[PDB]
Amino acid sequence: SVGSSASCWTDVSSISTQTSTISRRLRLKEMATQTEGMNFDDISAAVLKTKIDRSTQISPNTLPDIVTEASEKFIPNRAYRVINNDEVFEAGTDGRFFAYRVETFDEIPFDVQKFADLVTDSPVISAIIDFKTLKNLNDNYGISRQQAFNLLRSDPRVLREFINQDNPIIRNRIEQLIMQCRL
């Protein structure tokens, strides 16, 4: 147990390894109602409901274990974040970690043994708007304080407002999420 003490929410570069292992249970934080944002499995189920109403090949013996292969193989790699005193600690199943400040995007050494103590109890958020694209956006499409706070919080309102403002730095990320929702 890295952190305060044994939780079983944090059970385990060593850092990258630990973070991927913790994110394979942050998927369960996602499907345990302990999230705040677009809750990636929700996008997966929306893709499922948008595909199985169009696909001609749907049948009684057929949908069973297709629902499960979907739930299992939609978005295999997926990242999460936790906010504490205006300092975001990210993490991903792909072994990547990013610490950064909300107002002024600039990286920081990733504080392990604190990220765990925080992600354990504090709410988690999903990486629909992940740091890479977030910084590309803050660079090219200059961003306001409230819009940035809402994008950190993963608000569907501001998300759809950008998607209607035709921001390729978000359209590309959403297309990547689709192409990962492939089966």
């Binding site: 996602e30 499907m31 809750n39 499995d41 929700d42 997966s44 189920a45 739930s71």
Partner: peptide, 16 residues
């Protein structure tokens, strides 16, 4: 919500 459907499937597992 769209994950609540999975949680509801799990909840109603007893009906299987």
């Amino acid at each position: 919500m769209a994950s609540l459907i999975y949680r509801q499937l799990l909840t109603n597992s007893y009906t299987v």
